[model samples]
Target chain A: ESYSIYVYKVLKQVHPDTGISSKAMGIMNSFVNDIFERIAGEASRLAHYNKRSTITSREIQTAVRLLLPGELAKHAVSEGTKAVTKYTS
Target chain B: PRKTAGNRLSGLLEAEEEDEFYQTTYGGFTEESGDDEYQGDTEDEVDSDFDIDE
Candidate 1:
């Protein structure tokens, strides 16, 4: 099975009581994938703009802030920072 | 009562004064709708608190 199916199951866990159609699950997975790709692309562009060969947490943070709205962006940034800290430390 | 920002089933909401889009099935039929009142603004018209450094 594809990783999208894994993501679909992860999404299903968000609302365990509700039933999701296969089409809806597929669409949601694609939507999230598109957003993630766009953010990564934008972060890479930011790194290039700064003349850096490698993308960093700063670029990803800035990209997320630019793409997401207020509270959501703040929450995402917090979670991202936490994950990065866990990975690096 | 209007659907607040805190509403969970926001997808099922339709504001009385807001613009609405109707879905159609192309395999069977097609439907279209238009709005005489265009309230949308350009990208430059939107306001944001954050400013990116160049």
Candidate 2:
């Protein structure tokens, strides 16, 4: 429920014909939240290990690479990189 | 953080090879290194990699 309605809307756009149940959406939202929390924690730990006070984009990139594999890692990194560009611009 | 590079990563890495150092560290541990034991319940639903991601 905390996940944006915009995300649900986009999910609908991505798979228009299929009607997603509330339970399905809840599970998907929880999964997304869980993954991001892991990444953030790992990124912070990486920064601490490096004796750095701040986590950098490199930390995030490294965390993604370490946590994900194959095509999933590639897609996640690509999406992250795209989002970074959008944020900066 | 300011320790000599040789002492920092020891045999694991070199100071000059920044990229290689990170690559080696992030290479991750082998799952085979752990003690082999039955760690899960038979009744629990297991999600395979292919089942979850795609």
Candidate 3:
């Protein structure tokens, strides 16, 4: 397998009884991959514009805002902000 | 609801570790239907919280 069963495991959280189809799994994988690539692309552009060789978390927050839009963007940022500042005690 | 400030950024999350943080991210970012709630923001906008300049 190229990837882990992580998706399947998470799928169980909401639908604890049902089994997933391969096609369903494939789409989930594709969806995440697509977002990763798009966000990476945006962050790369931002870095190139600013003359930086590295992508900082700032670029990630900036990228997420650009890519996700509206409530999703706001929510993701809040979750990300919380994770960075409030986990691993 | 609970939080503990962390030194966690060398930290990309591992797939094996399950948490509400990951769950919430996936939950909100994906939707199946009833989502035609955009007038224009999908095309482009110029508002921002961070600087893209020096």
Candidate 4:
């Protein structure tokens, strides 16, 4: 699996009650899936894309920037990066 | 009723766009259902106070 898939792998650890809200988890799953899919698609098109294979917190930050460019994007990337690093390590 | 700086922003949800594009797919810069100023300004406050996942 690509590094992007790791986001979900880690997210599962954060919210272990996936069974409680399978649908909510599914929605979040879809979001990360789309992120990886975009990364893969772009990586394929631009061979020089030297981004990490796994979705690092920074990678997710950039992905959110690409996904939603604005103040919200900035806040999400900033907070999300912290969340990822906090929980992951 | 109407809108104010603080408390009265309730019930002012911005309605979902009844467009095929919005209904069909997810994730885009669609207008959030609420007063723009109040919605935009209260992001941090809302995040801190309201727990959507319960």
Highest lDDT against the true fold, candidate: 3
Q: What residue pairs are clashing in model 3?
A: none
lDDT: worst 10-residue window of model 3 chain B? B35-44
DockQ class, candidate 3 = incorrect
Q: Is candidate 2 or candidate 4 better by DockQ?
A: 4
Q: Give the clash total for candidate 4.
A: 4
Q: For each candidate, what is the lDDT?
A: 0.65, 0.66, 0.67, 0.50
Looking at candidate 1 chain B, the ten consecutive residues that score lowest on lDDT are: B35-44
TM-score of 2: 0.55
Residues A13-79, candidate 1, lDDT per residue (tens digit)?
8976566554444455666776888899999899888998766789999999999998999999999
Q: What is the lDDT of candidate 3?
A: 0.67
| Prediction-by-prediction clash tally | 0, 0, 0, 4
Flag clash pairs in model 1: none
Per-residue lDDT of B1-54 in model 2, one digit per residue for the tens?
A: 756655656656644555643334323222334324221121335566523321
Q: DockQ, in order, for the candidates?
A: 0.04, 0.02, 0.02, 0.04
**Against the native chain B, what TM-score does each candidate's chain B reach?**
0.14, 0.15, 0.23, 0.16
**What's the lDDT for residue A75 in model 2?**
98
Candidate 2 local lDDT, A11-75, one digit each (tens): 76898665554544545566677788889999999988998866767899999999998999999
Better of 1 and 3 by TM-score: 1
Interface RMSD of each: 15.2, 17.9, 12.4, 15.3
lDDT of 3 by residue, A1-89 (tens): 22326666676687877665454455567677768889999999999999997777789899999989789999999988888666433
- Winner by TM-score: 1
Runs in model 1 lying further than 4 Å from the true structure = A1-3, B1-14, B17-54
Please identify model 3 stretches exceeding 4 Å from their true place. Answer: A1-4, A87-89, B1-54
